[PDB]
Amino acid sequence: YQQPPVPYRQIDDCPAKARPQHIFYRRFLGKDGRRDPKCQWKFAVIFWGNDPYGLKKLSQAFQFGGVKAGPVSCLPHPGPDQSPITYCVYVYCQNKDTSKKVQMARLAWEASHPLAGNLQSSIVKFKKPLPLTQ
């Protein structure tokens, strides 16, 4: 049983290994990274890959009022046999627009740093709003 990442009061509370990626997202998202009381959480973007540590850093980075990433999880085995683990992180955003900027934000970071892994991603829509208000 895993636990959710810790929210930030200041940049320093964000783990030192994730700060570079966190600050980049803070500036890129800008106003879209802030919270909208009027909007509900019916959207998210799911990144997945084979490196859990990289996805860990991503999960710790995407931590804002309007953009909250879940802990490092994983998808179930694709076949009947046990297979190499495909880890994943759900980055919950406010609206469909923000989701596109978030998955773009990571794409921008991937372009800025070729050492970073090329993570697959998909936009996610929930029929009912998730309890992520206030």
Instruction: State the residues that interact with a second copy by CB under 8 A.
Output: 1-9, 24, 27-28, 35-38, 46, 48, 52, 56, 63, 65, 68-83, 85-87, 90, 92, 101, 104-105, 107-108, 110-112, 114, 120-134
- Distance, in Å, from the CA atom of 14 to the CA atom of 127, rounded to the nearest integer, reads 32
Least CB distance to a second copy at residue 18 (A):
14
> Of 29, 17, 96, whose CA–CA distance to 65 is shortest?
29
* 106 CB burial (10 A radius; 0-12, 13-18, 19+): buried
Cβ proximity to a second copy, 16 vs 99, nearer residue: 99
The first and second tokens of residue 87, run together, are 């880890």
